[PDB]
Design a protein around this ligand. Sequence first.
Ligand SMILES: [Zn+2]
Length: 323
Amino acid sequence: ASAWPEEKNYHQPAILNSSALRQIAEGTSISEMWQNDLQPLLIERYPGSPGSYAARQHIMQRIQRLQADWVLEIDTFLSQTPYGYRSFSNIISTLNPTAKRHLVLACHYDSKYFSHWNNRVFVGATDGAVPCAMMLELARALDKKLLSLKPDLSLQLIFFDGEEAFLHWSPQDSLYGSRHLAAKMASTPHPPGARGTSQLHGMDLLVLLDLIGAPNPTFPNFFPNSARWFERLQAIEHELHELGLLKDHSLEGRYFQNYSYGGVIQDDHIPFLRRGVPVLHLIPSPFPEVWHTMDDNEENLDESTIDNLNKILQVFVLEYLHL
Ligand SMILES: [Zn+2]
Protein backbone atom coordinates (compact mmCIF):
# COMPACT_ATOMS: atom_id res chain seq x y z
CA ALA A 1 0.00 0.00 0.00
CA SER A 2 1.90 3.11 -1.23
CA ALA A 3 2.41 5.90 1.26
CA TRP A 4 2.54 8.60 -1.47
CA PRO A 5 -0.35 10.63 0.06
CA GLU A 6 1.95 11.21 3.06
CA GLU A 7 4.67 12.84 0.94
CA LYS A 8 3.07 16.31 1.36
CA ASN A 9 3.83 16.04 5.10
CA TYR A 10 7.64 16.02 4.49
CA HIS A 11 7.81 18.02 1.31
CA GLN A 12 10.33 20.88 1.60
CA PRO A 13 10.72 23.88 -0.71
CA ALA A 14 13.77 24.47 -2.95
CA ILE A 15 14.59 28.01 -1.86
CA LEU A 16 15.50 30.64 -4.46
CA ASN A 17 18.69 32.67 -4.06
CA SER A 18 18.92 36.51 -4.39
CA SER A 19 19.56 36.46 -8.12
CA ALA A 20 16.58 34.15 -8.72
CA LEU A 21 14.43 36.38 -6.51
CA ARG A 22 15.30 39.50 -8.48
CA GLN A 23 14.40 37.55 -11.63
CA ILE A 24 10.93 36.67 -10.40
CA ALA A 25 10.33 40.25 -9.19
CA GLU A 26 11.31 41.60 -12.62
CA GLY A 27 9.33 38.99 -14.56
CA THR A 28 5.82 39.87 -13.40
CA SER A 29 4.09 42.98 -14.70
CA ILE A 30 1.34 44.58 -12.64
CA SER A 31 0.40 46.86 -15.56
CA GLU A 32 0.08 43.93 -18.01
CA MET A 33 -2.03 42.01 -15.48
CA TRP A 34 -4.23 45.08 -14.88
CA GLN A 35 -4.96 45.60 -18.54
CA ASN A 36 -5.03 42.04 -19.87
CA ASP A 37 -6.29 39.89 -16.98
CA LEU A 38 -8.11 42.13 -14.44
CA GLN A 39 -10.14 44.77 -16.32
CA PRO A 40 -11.97 42.20 -18.48
CA LEU A 41 -13.16 40.65 -15.22
CA LEU A 42 -14.48 43.90 -13.72
CA ILE A 43 -18.05 43.19 -14.79
CA GLU A 44 -21.22 41.85 -13.20
CA ARG A 45 -20.78 38.05 -13.18
CA TYR A 46 -23.17 36.34 -10.79
CA PRO A 47 -24.01 32.67 -11.61
CA GLY A 48 -26.05 32.14 -14.75
CA SER A 49 -25.50 35.71 -15.97
CA PRO A 50 -24.07 36.79 -19.33
CA GLY A 51 -21.07 38.20 -17.47
CA SER A 52 -20.46 34.83 -15.82
CA TYR A 53 -20.18 33.35 -19.29
CA ALA A 54 -17.84 36.12 -20.46
CA ALA A 55 -15.68 35.77 -17.34
CA ARG A 56 -15.26 32.05 -17.99
CA GLN A 57 -14.30 32.61 -21.67
CA HIS A 58 -11.77 35.24 -20.66
CA ILE A 59 -10.19 32.95 -18.06
CA MET A 60 -9.99 29.97 -20.45
CA GLN A 61 -8.65 32.13 -23.33
CA ARG A 62 -5.92 33.70 -21.18
CA ILE A 63 -4.83 30.23 -20.07
CA GLN A 64 -5.02 28.66 -23.56
CA ARG A 65 -2.61 31.22 -25.03
CA LEU A 66 0.23 30.12 -22.73
CA GLN A 67 2.95 27.62 -23.73
CA ALA A 68 2.65 25.36 -20.69
CA ASP A 69 0.47 22.30 -21.30
CA TRP A 70 -2.62 23.39 -19.33
CA VAL A 71 -5.57 21.05 -19.41
CA LEU A 72 -8.85 22.89 -18.98
CA GLU A 73 -12.04 21.34 -17.66
CA ILE A 74 -15.39 23.01 -16.97
CA ASP A 75 -17.14 21.34 -14.03
CA THR A 76 -20.86 22.11 -14.62
CA PHE A 77 -23.63 21.14 -12.24
CA LEU A 78 -27.05 21.89 -10.84
CA SER A 79 -27.88 22.98 -7.37
CA GLN A 80 -30.98 24.11 -5.54
CA THR A 81 -30.78 27.85 -4.58
CA PRO A 82 -33.11 30.43 -2.93
CA TYR A 83 -34.23 31.15 -6.54
CA GLY A 84 -34.80 27.53 -7.56
CA TYR A 85 -32.52 25.12 -9.42
CA ARG A 86 -29.59 26.75 -11.20
CA SER A 87 -26.51 25.82 -13.18
CA PHE A 88 -22.94 26.61 -12.04
CA SER A 89 -19.60 26.05 -13.82
CA ASN A 90 -16.30 25.63 -11.93
CA ILE A 91 -13.14 26.08 -14.06
CA ILE A 92 -10.22 23.73 -13.37
CA SER A 93 -6.87 24.29 -15.09
CA THR A 94 -4.36 21.50 -14.54
CA LEU A 95 -0.73 20.82 -15.44
CA ASN A 96 0.07 17.06 -15.54
CA PRO A 97 -3.43 15.64 -14.90
CA THR A 98 -2.19 12.16 -14.02
CA ALA A 99 0.48 13.55 -11.69
CA LYS A 100 -0.25 12.11 -8.23
CA ARG A 101 0.25 15.36 -6.34
CA HIS A 102 -0.71 18.92 -7.09
CA LEU A 103 -0.18 22.22 -5.37
CA VAL A 104 -3.54 23.94 -5.84
CA LEU A 105 -4.22 27.69 -6.11
CA ALA A 106 -7.81 28.80 -6.06
CA CYS A 107 -10.19 31.80 -6.05
CA HIS A 108 -13.85 32.30 -7.06
CA TYR A 109 -14.80 34.07 -10.29
CA ASP A 110 -18.47 34.72 -9.60
CA SER A 111 -19.48 38.16 -8.21
CA LYS A 112 -22.17 38.49 -5.52
CA TYR A 113 -25.60 39.16 -7.00
CA PHE A 114 -27.03 42.63 -6.31
CA SER A 115 -29.77 44.39 -8.24
CA HIS A 116 -28.45 47.68 -9.73
CA TRP A 117 -28.70 50.49 -7.21
CA ASN A 118 -28.70 54.13 -8.26
CA ASN A 119 -26.99 53.02 -11.49
CA ARG A 120 -24.19 51.28 -9.65
CA VAL A 121 -23.25 47.68 -10.46
CA PHE A 122 -21.39 45.35 -8.03
CA VAL A 123 -18.19 44.02 -9.55
CA GLY A 124 -16.31 42.62 -6.49
CA ALA A 125 -12.87 43.92 -7.50
CA THR A 126 -11.10 42.30 -4.49
CA ASP A 127 -13.79 39.66 -4.38
CA GLY A 128 -12.51 37.95 -6.34
CA ALA A 129 -11.55 39.67 -9.62
CA VAL A 130 -8.02 40.52 -8.35
CA PRO A 131 -7.46 36.99 -6.92
CA CYS A 132 -8.49 35.60 -10.38
CA ALA A 133 -6.20 38.05 -12.23
CA MET A 134 -3.30 37.21 -9.89
CA MET A 135 -3.66 33.50 -10.72
CA LEU A 136 -3.67 34.33 -14.49
CA GLU A 137 -0.64 36.64 -14.12
CA LEU A 138 1.15 33.87 -12.21
CA ALA A 139 0.40 31.39 -15.03
CA ARG A 140 1.74 33.96 -17.51
CA ALA A 141 4.83 35.07 -15.54
CA LEU A 142 6.00 31.55 -14.79
CA ASP A 143 4.98 30.03 -18.12
CA LYS A 144 8.50 29.27 -19.31
CA LYS A 145 9.36 27.59 -16.01
CA LEU A 146 6.03 25.75 -15.85
CA LEU A 147 6.54 24.48 -19.44
CA SER A 148 9.42 22.41 -18.05
CA LEU A 149 6.90 20.23 -16.16
CA LYS A 150 5.61 18.83 -19.46
CA PRO A 151 8.43 14.37 -6.86
CA ASP A 152 5.38 13.41 -9.01
CA LEU A 153 4.14 16.93 -8.25
CA SER A 154 2.58 19.59 -10.41
CA LEU A 155 0.23 22.59 -10.42
CA GLN A 156 -3.51 23.14 -10.58
CA LEU A 157 -5.68 26.27 -10.59
CA ILE A 158 -9.39 26.22 -9.67
CA PHE A 159 -11.73 29.19 -10.33
CA PHE A 160 -14.87 28.41 -8.31
CA ASP A 161 -18.32 29.46 -9.39
CA GLY A 162 -21.06 30.27 -6.84
CA GLU A 163 -18.87 31.06 -3.87
CA GLU A 164 -21.37 33.80 -2.88
CA ALA A 165 -24.74 33.45 -1.20
CA PHE A 166 -27.62 34.60 -3.41
CA LEU A 167 -29.11 36.22 -0.23
CA HIS A 168 -26.99 36.49 2.93
CA TRP A 169 -24.76 33.60 3.97
CA SER A 170 -26.46 30.37 5.09
CA PRO A 171 -25.11 26.77 5.04
CA GLN A 172 -27.20 25.89 1.98
CA ASP A 173 -26.91 29.26 0.21
CA SER A 174 -23.19 29.73 -0.50
CA LEU A 175 -20.09 27.81 -1.60
CA TYR A 176 -22.04 26.07 -4.38
CA GLY A 177 -19.05 25.33 -6.63
CA SER A 178 -16.66 24.32 -3.85
CA ARG A 179 -19.07 22.08 -1.93
CA HIS A 180 -19.77 20.39 -5.25
CA LEU A 181 -16.16 20.08 -6.44
CA ALA A 182 -14.84 18.91 -3.06
CA ALA A 183 -17.39 16.03 -2.95
CA LYS A 184 -16.61 15.20 -6.57
CA MET A 185 -12.84 15.13 -6.06
CA ALA A 186 -13.32 13.13 -2.85
CA SER A 187 -15.13 10.48 -4.90
CA THR A 188 -12.82 10.42 -7.94
CA PRO A 189 -9.99 7.83 -7.84
CA HIS A 190 -6.54 9.28 -8.37
CA PRO A 191 -4.28 8.76 -10.07
CA PRO A 192 -6.33 7.03 -12.82
CA GLY A 193 -6.82 3.36 -11.96
CA ALA A 194 -6.12 3.82 -8.28
CA ARG A 195 -7.76 1.38 -5.84
CA GLY A 196 -8.16 3.56 -2.72
CA THR A 197 -6.88 7.13 -3.12
CA SER A 198 -8.86 10.12 -4.41
CA GLN A 199 -8.04 13.47 -6.04
CA LEU A 200 -8.34 14.94 -2.52
CA HIS A 201 -5.48 12.73 -1.32
CA GLY A 202 -3.51 14.22 -4.26
CA MET A 203 -4.07 17.82 -3.07
CA ASP A 204 -0.83 18.68 -1.39
CA LEU A 205 -2.12 22.05 -0.24
CA LEU A 206 -4.98 24.34 -1.20
CA VAL A 207 -3.90 28.00 -1.42
CA LEU A 208 -7.10 30.06 -1.52
CA LEU A 209 -6.97 33.76 -2.43
CA ASP A 210 -9.90 36.01 -1.65
CA LEU A 211 -10.60 39.67 -0.77
CA ILE A 212 -7.21 40.74 -2.02
CA GLY A 213 -6.53 44.19 -3.48
CA ALA A 214 -7.22 46.62 -0.64
CA PRO A 215 -4.44 48.63 1.15
CA ASN A 216 -2.69 47.19 4.20
CA PRO A 217 -3.95 43.57 4.24
CA THR A 218 -3.01 41.38 7.21
CA PHE A 219 -3.19 37.62 6.61
CA PRO A 220 -3.36 35.54 9.79
CA ASN A 221 -1.90 32.04 10.21
CA PHE A 222 -5.18 30.12 10.42
CA PHE A 223 -4.23 26.45 10.50
CA PRO A 224 -1.59 24.47 12.30
CA ASN A 225 -1.23 21.90 9.53
CA SER A 226 -0.19 24.60 7.01
CA ALA A 227 1.62 26.83 9.48
CA ARG A 228 5.06 25.94 8.17
CA TRP A 229 3.91 27.16 4.70
CA PHE A 230 2.52 30.38 6.17
CA GLU A 231 6.04 30.82 7.62
CA ARG A 232 7.59 30.38 4.15
CA LEU A 233 5.34 33.22 2.86
CA GLN A 234 6.61 35.33 5.80
CA ALA A 235 10.20 34.49 4.94
CA ILE A 236 9.67 35.24 1.27
CA GLU A 237 8.05 38.58 2.03
CA HIS A 238 10.91 39.43 4.37
CA GLU A 239 13.66 38.58 1.89
CA LEU A 240 11.96 40.30 -1.12
CA HIS A 241 11.62 43.32 1.18
CA GLU A 242 15.30 43.22 2.28
CA LEU A 243 16.40 42.87 -1.35
CA GLY A 244 14.45 46.06 -2.11
CA LEU A 245 12.15 44.12 -4.44
CA LEU A 246 8.79 45.27 -3.00
CA LYS A 247 7.13 48.66 -3.43
CA ASP A 248 5.89 51.03 -0.67
CA HIS A 249 6.37 48.27 1.85
CA SER A 250 7.58 48.17 5.44
CA LEU A 251 8.20 45.22 7.76
CA GLU A 252 6.03 46.93 10.46
CA GLY A 253 3.22 46.97 7.87
CA ARG A 254 4.02 43.45 6.58
CA TYR A 255 1.17 41.38 5.19
CA PHE A 256 1.98 38.01 6.78
CA GLN A 257 1.88 38.51 10.46
CA ASN A 258 2.53 36.26 13.35
CA TYR A 259 -0.86 35.57 14.93
CA SER A 260 -3.66 33.05 14.75
CA TYR A 261 -7.39 33.47 14.28
CA GLY A 262 -9.57 31.31 16.52
CA GLY A 263 -12.76 31.79 14.51
CA VAL A 264 -13.97 30.34 11.25
CA ILE A 265 -14.28 32.32 8.02
CA GLN A 266 -16.70 30.93 5.46
CA ASP A 267 -15.08 30.57 2.03
CA ASP A 268 -14.39 28.00 -0.70
CA HIS A 269 -11.78 26.22 1.37
CA ILE A 270 -14.32 25.00 3.94
CA PRO A 271 -15.61 21.95 1.94
CA PHE A 272 -11.98 20.90 1.40
CA LEU A 273 -10.75 21.59 4.93
CA ARG A 274 -13.66 19.52 6.32
CA ARG A 275 -12.53 16.55 4.21
CA GLY A 276 -8.94 16.77 5.47
CA VAL A 277 -7.22 18.88 2.85
CA PRO A 278 -4.39 21.16 4.15
CA VAL A 279 -5.35 24.80 3.50
CA LEU A 280 -3.39 28.03 3.36
CA HIS A 281 -6.20 30.64 3.39
CA LEU A 282 -4.97 33.94 1.98
CA ILE A 283 -7.90 36.06 3.00
CA PRO A 284 -7.12 39.09 5.13
CA SER A 285 -8.53 39.79 8.58
CA PRO A 286 -10.15 42.24 8.92
CA PHE A 287 -11.91 42.21 5.52
CA PRO A 288 -11.43 45.16 3.07
CA GLU A 289 -13.50 48.20 4.19
CA VAL A 290 -15.32 48.00 0.82
CA TRP A 291 -16.38 44.37 1.40
CA HIS A 292 -19.74 43.63 -0.27
CA THR A 293 -20.49 47.25 -1.20
CA MET A 294 -20.61 49.01 -4.59
CA ASP A 295 -17.29 50.53 -3.60
CA ASP A 296 -15.45 47.24 -4.03
CA ASN A 297 -14.26 48.55 -7.36
CA GLU A 298 -11.18 49.31 -9.47
CA GLU A 299 -10.60 52.76 -8.02
CA ASN A 300 -10.25 51.39 -4.49
CA LEU A 301 -7.62 48.77 -5.36
CA ASP A 302 -3.99 49.24 -4.21
CA GLU A 303 -1.69 48.51 -7.17
CA SER A 304 1.65 48.24 -5.37
CA THR A 305 0.19 45.91 -2.76
CA ILE A 306 -1.21 43.62 -5.48
CA ASP A 307 2.18 43.79 -7.29
CA ASN A 308 4.02 42.82 -4.06
CA LEU A 309 1.63 39.91 -3.42
CA ASN A 310 2.14 38.69 -7.01
CA LYS A 311 5.86 38.49 -6.37
CA ILE A 312 5.44 36.69 -3.04
CA LEU A 313 2.97 34.14 -4.49
CA GLN A 314 5.11 33.43 -7.59
CA VAL A 315 8.22 32.80 -5.47
CA PHE A 316 6.18 30.58 -3.12
CA VAL A 317 4.86 28.49 -6.05
CA LEU A 318 8.32 28.08 -7.69
CA GLU A 319 9.94 27.07 -4.41
CA TYR A 320 7.14 24.59 -3.71
CA LEU A 321 7.43 23.01 -7.20
CA HIS A 322 11.22 23.07 -7.11
CA LEU A 323 11.25 25.28 -10.24
ZN1 LIG B 1 -17.82 38.21 -1.23
